[PDB]
Scaffold this active site. Structure first.
Site, PDB file in Angstrom:
ATOM      1  N   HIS A  69       0.831  -1.196   0.000  1.00 25.69           N
ATOM      2  CA  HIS A  69       0.000   0.000   0.000  1.00 25.69           C
ATOM      3  C   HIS A  69       0.871   1.254   0.000  1.00 25.69           C
ATOM      4  O   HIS A  69       0.636   2.185  -0.773  1.00 25.69           O
ATOM      5  CB  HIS A  69      -0.939  -0.008   1.211  1.00 25.69           C
ATOM      6  CG  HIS A  69      -1.602   1.308   1.478  1.00 25.69           C
ATOM      7  ND1 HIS A  69      -2.930   1.542   1.193  1.00 25.69           N
ATOM      8  CD2 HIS A  69      -1.126   2.456   2.018  1.00 25.69           C
ATOM      9  CE1 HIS A  69      -3.242   2.778   1.540  1.00 25.69           C
ATOM     10  NE2 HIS A  69      -2.165   3.353   2.042  1.00 25.69           N
ATOM     11  N   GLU A  70       1.876   1.273   0.871  1.00 21.84           N
ATOM     12  CA  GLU A  70       2.806   2.395   0.934  1.00 21.84           C
ATOM     13  C   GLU A  70       3.580   2.543  -0.370  1.00 21.84           C
ATOM     14  O   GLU A  70       3.861   3.654  -0.810  1.00 21.84           O
ATOM     15  CB  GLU A  70       3.787   2.227   2.095  1.00 21.84           C
ATOM     16  CG  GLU A  70       3.142   2.022   3.457  1.00 21.84           C
ATOM     17  CD  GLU A  70       2.315   3.204   3.906  1.00 21.84           C
ATOM     18  OE1 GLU A  70       1.504   3.034   4.839  1.00 21.84           O
ATOM     19  OE2 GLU A  70       2.474   4.300   3.331  1.00 21.84           O
ATOM     20  N   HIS A  91       1.901   4.464  -2.968  1.00 25.02           N
ATOM     21  CA  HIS A  91       2.100   5.896  -2.812  1.00 25.02           C
ATOM     22  C   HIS A  91       3.337   6.368  -3.562  1.00 25.02           C
ATOM     23  O   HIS A  91       3.343   7.445  -4.154  1.00 25.02           O
ATOM     24  CB  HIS A  91       2.217   6.256  -1.337  1.00 25.02           C
ATOM     25  CG  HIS A  91       0.907   6.544  -0.681  1.00 25.02           C
ATOM     26  ND1 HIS A  91      -0.137   7.148  -1.346  1.00 25.02           N
ATOM     27  CD2 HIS A  91       0.470   6.313   0.579  1.00 25.02           C
ATOM     28  CE1 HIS A  91      -1.161   7.279  -0.523  1.00 25.02           C
ATOM     29  NE2 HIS A  91      -0.818   6.782   0.651  1.00 25.02           N
ATOM     30  N   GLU A 141      -5.093   8.218  -1.169  1.00 25.09           N
ATOM     31  CA  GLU A 141      -5.435   7.015  -0.419  1.00 25.09           C
ATOM     32  C   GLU A 141      -6.176   6.002  -1.280  1.00 25.09           C
ATOM     33  O   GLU A 141      -5.904   4.803  -1.215  1.00 25.09           O
ATOM     34  CB  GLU A 141      -6.280   7.370   0.806  1.00 25.09           C
ATOM     35  CG  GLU A 141      -5.607   8.335   1.766  1.00 25.09           C
ATOM     36  CD  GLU A 141      -4.363   7.749   2.395  1.00 25.09           C
ATOM     37  OE1 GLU A 141      -4.170   6.523   2.277  1.00 25.09           O
ATOM     38  OE2 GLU A 141      -3.581   8.509   3.007  1.00 25.09           O
ATOM     39  N   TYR A 166     -11.362   2.939   3.909  1.00 22.54           N
ATOM     40  CA  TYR A 166     -10.307   3.931   4.062  1.00 22.54           C
ATOM     41  C   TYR A 166      -9.913   4.524   2.713  1.00 22.54           C
ATOM     42  O   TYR A 166      -9.360   5.621   2.646  1.00 22.54           O
ATOM     43  CB  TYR A 166      -9.077   3.336   4.755  1.00 22.54           C
ATOM     44  CG  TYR A 166      -8.041   4.388   5.064  1.00 22.54           C
ATOM     45  CD1 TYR A 166      -8.191   5.232   6.156  1.00 22.54           C
ATOM     46  CD2 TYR A 166      -6.930   4.560   4.250  1.00 22.54           C
ATOM     47  CE1 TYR A 166      -7.256   6.212   6.437  1.00 22.54           C
ATOM     48  CE2 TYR A 166      -5.991   5.537   4.521  1.00 22.54           C
ATOM     49  CZ  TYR A 166      -6.157   6.360   5.616  1.00 22.54           C
ATOM     50  OH  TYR A 166      -5.226   7.335   5.888  1.00 22.54           O
TER      51      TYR A 166
HETATM   52  C1  LIG Z   1      -1.240  -4.317   9.793  1.00 16.36           C
HETATM   53  O1  LIG Z   1      -0.699  -3.200   9.086  1.00 16.36           O
HETATM   54  C2  LIG Z   1      -1.730  -2.410   8.499  1.00 16.36           C
HETATM   55  C3  LIG Z   1      -1.205  -1.069   8.037  1.00 16.36           C
HETATM   56  C4  LIG Z   1      -0.005  -0.969   7.343  1.00 16.36           C
HETATM   57  C5  LIG Z   1       0.461   0.276   6.929  1.00 16.36           C
HETATM   58  C6  LIG Z   1      -0.271   1.425   7.213  1.00 16.36           C
HETATM   59  C7  LIG Z   1      -1.470   1.323   7.909  1.00 16.36           C
HETATM   60  S1  LIG Z   1      -2.339   2.610   8.273  1.00 16.36           S
HETATM   61  O2  LIG Z   1      -1.560   3.389   9.192  1.00 16.36           O
HETATM   62  O3  LIG Z   1      -3.522   2.160   8.949  1.00 16.36           O
HETATM   63  N1  LIG Z   1      -2.747   3.498   7.097  1.00 16.36           N
HETATM   64  C8  LIG Z   1      -3.905   3.215   6.241  1.00 16.36           C
HETATM   65  C9  LIG Z   1      -3.865   1.763   5.761  1.00 16.36           C
HETATM   66  C10 LIG Z   1      -5.204   1.314   5.185  1.00 16.36           C
HETATM   67  C11 LIG Z   1      -2.749   1.534   4.751  1.00 16.36           C
HETATM   68  C12 LIG Z   1      -2.024   4.746   6.802  1.00 16.36           C
HETATM   69  C13 LIG Z   1      -1.740   5.006   5.345  1.00 16.36           C
HETATM   70  O4  LIG Z   1      -2.813   5.424   4.433  1.00 16.36           O
HETATM   71  N2  LIG Z   1      -0.463   4.886   4.884  1.00 16.36           N
HETATM   72  O5  LIG Z   1      -0.129   5.239   3.619  1.00 16.36           O
HETATM   73  C14 LIG Z   1      -2.882   5.928   7.270  1.00 16.36           C
HETATM   74  C15 LIG Z   1      -3.471   5.811   8.674  1.00 16.36           C
HETATM   75  C16 LIG Z   1      -2.104   7.235   7.137  1.00 16.36           C
HETATM   76  C17 LIG Z   1      -1.931   0.079   8.322  1.00 16.36           C
HETATM   77 ZN   LIG Z   2      -1.864   5.784   2.643  1.00 14.84          ZN
END
Ligand SMILES: COCc1cccc(S(=O)(=O)N(CC(C)C)[C@@H](C(=O)NO)C(C)C)c1
Ligand SMILES: [Zn+2]
Length: 500
Positions: free
Chosen positions: A410-411, A414, A459, A452
């Site tokens: 996911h990161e 980005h 996002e 999310y």
């Molecule tokens: C078990 O790991 C799960 C996990 C992995 C990496 C990040 C997060 S996250 O912090 O919840 N998170 C959103 C998730 C859906 C990616 C952050 C984010 O959009 N990053 O780019 C967001 C709050 C800024 C959770």
């Molecule tokens: Zn993110």
């Protein structure tokens, strides 16, 4: 004997205890019992439009305690109206989040051990008010000066010290399902083996407070540490049969077993205190190794610093061992050319993959580009375009995601977003999700994917990217089906990036 062992240790520190000044004892008391915020003074400081805002706000949409304190804060504000209104009252507005981001700086308790754990000992991290930051530093230095007497050569191998602990403290990811669902008195044998396989060493960056005699577990205290000190481990006696250990110590995990106490199953962790530098060495050796592997695998210069282990806390070795697995799943589910191209871009901007057990606001890859603390973010993961870095926080629990492998990808989505927009205009260098084409795509399909993913364009793109590279065939198809425009848009950018 429990009471005999207790008196023997107390005696060993009796002269130390009696020598404590009034300020020394209060300092030790303040450490054990952190000074909580004064919710009356907080509420009083708010405008009555902010009270009404705080009254009706759904605070969990943004720590759990922070939400619990705010809920404790809200309940105290709400206890002046109807019964019917309260029962009725039971993403955010940008007016709401902007409010909470500034309110977070006013509800932080003065917690020395928490300040140490969050920063990993790097207390000069600009993540709190400067004056308070200097106050922690004075107390910490003063506590260090107090804890000068070691356990000694006589007692170190004649006693065990104990610490009951919640599993979520180490990693809230594995803590969710380490207790059997069918039987809560049992530990899941599967998770236990993996948990045990990757725990070889631990670090305490704050002051461990241990029991001289083993104390029966409370509610979620399924972890029971048994610690053997080293002869020169500095400590101090605390009332009611407890020792406060010096900060910055290392622990080698000698044995992890499942034991039975009172027809309930607990995990016993046997650990021996070692020099912290001995463990920092193993960490740094592991950091250099994983970089050597991935520099060759990615076609990078041999000495390139890409992967960072910012590790300072109690489940240290797993943060190290998880990075290996995470990058492997990353490599397996994403085209090698998409990876190399984007990674080389990050390296151009001196980027990092940061795997850490300290909070992200205390990560230099974030705060050097984020001076305002109310803009500093803590979460499981993050991508910081200013430093072209991916930050992953091991311990915390993530929103709506299963494992950390999905989190990293996911990161990485980005970073793909970033690189796509760069190639589109190398002088502007904006995110491709800020392009008008994708903006319109988001306005339509933005509510189809994950909850999310509805936050914003960036996002949405990241979540879409993640699901398009899932091991689960179904979730790849859901994107192609529920968001066809988004699905094609990403594949466009992927094709665009590769053909550069
Ligand atoms: C078990 O790991 C799960 C996990 C992995 C990496 C990040 C997060 S996250 O912090 O919840 N998170 C959103 C998730 C859906 C990616 C952050 C984010 O959009 N990053 O780019 C967001 C709050 C800024 C959770
Ligand atoms: Zn993110």
């Amino acid at each position: 004997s429990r009471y005999e062992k207790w008196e023997k240790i107390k005696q060993h520190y009796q002269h130390w205890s009696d020598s404590l000044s009034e300020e020394g004892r209060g300092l030790l008391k303040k450490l054990q019992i952190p000074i909580e915020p004064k919710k009356d003074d907080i509420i009083h400081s708010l405008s009555q439009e902010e009270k009404e805002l705080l009254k009706r706000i759904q605070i969990d949409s943004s720590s759990t305690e922070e939400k619990e304190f705010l809920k404790k804060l809200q309940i105290d504000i709400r206890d002046s109206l109807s019964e019917e209104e309260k029962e009725l009252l039971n993403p955010l507005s940008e007016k709401e989040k902007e409010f909470l981001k500034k309110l977070k700086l006013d509800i932080q308790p003065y917690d020395i051990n928490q300040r140490l754990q969050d920063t990993g000992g790097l207390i000069d991290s600009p993540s709190i008010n400067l004056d308070v930051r200097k106050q922690y530093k004075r107390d910490i230095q003063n506590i260090d000066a107090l804890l000068h007497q070691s356990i000694g050569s006589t007692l170190y191998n004649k006693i065990y010290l104990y610490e009951n602990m919640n599993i979520n403290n180490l990693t809230a990811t594995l803590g969710a399902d380490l207790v059997d669902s069918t039987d809560n008195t049992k530990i899941n044998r599967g998770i236990f083996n993996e948990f045990k396989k990757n725990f070889k060493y631990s670090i305490s960056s704050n002051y461990m407070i241990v029991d001289i005699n083993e104390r029966p577990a409370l509610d979620n205290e399924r972890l029971k540490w048994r610690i053997q000190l080293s002869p020169d481990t500095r400590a101090g006696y605390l009332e009611n049969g407890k020792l406060i250990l010096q900060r910055n110590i290392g622990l080698e995990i000698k044995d992890v077993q499942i034991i039975k106490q009172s027809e309930k199953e607990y995990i016993r962790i046997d650990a021996k205190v070692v020099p912290k530098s001995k463990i920092d060495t193993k960490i740094q050796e592991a950091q250099l190794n994983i970089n050597q592997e991935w520099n060759k695998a990615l076609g990078l210069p041999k000495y390139t610093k890409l992967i960072t282990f910012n590790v300072h806390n109690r489940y240290a070795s797993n943060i190290v061992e998880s990075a290996y697995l995470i990058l492997n799943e990353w490599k397996n589910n994403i085209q090698s050319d998409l990876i190399k191209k984007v990674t080389n871009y990050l390296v151009d901007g001196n980027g990092r993959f940061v795997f850490t057990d300290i909070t992200l606001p205390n990560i230099a890859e974030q705060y050097t580009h984020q001076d305002e603390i109310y803009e500093q973010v803590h979460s499981k993961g993050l991508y910081v375009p200013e430093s072209r870095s991916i930050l992953l926080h091991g311990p915390s629990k993530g929103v709506e995601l299963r494992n950390d492998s999905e989190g990293f990808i996911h990161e990485f989505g980005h970073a793909v977003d970033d690189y796509a927009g760069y190639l589109l205009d190398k002088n502007q260098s904006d995110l491709v999700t800020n392009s008008k084409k994708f903006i319109d795509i988001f306005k339509e399909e933005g509510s189809n994917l994950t909850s999310y993913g509805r936050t914003n364009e960036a996002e949405f793109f990241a979540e879409a990217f993640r699901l398009m590279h899932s091991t689960d065939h179904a979730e790849r198809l859901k994107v192609q089906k529920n968001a066809p425009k988004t699905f094609q848009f990403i594949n466009d950018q992927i094709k665009f990036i590769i053909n550069s």
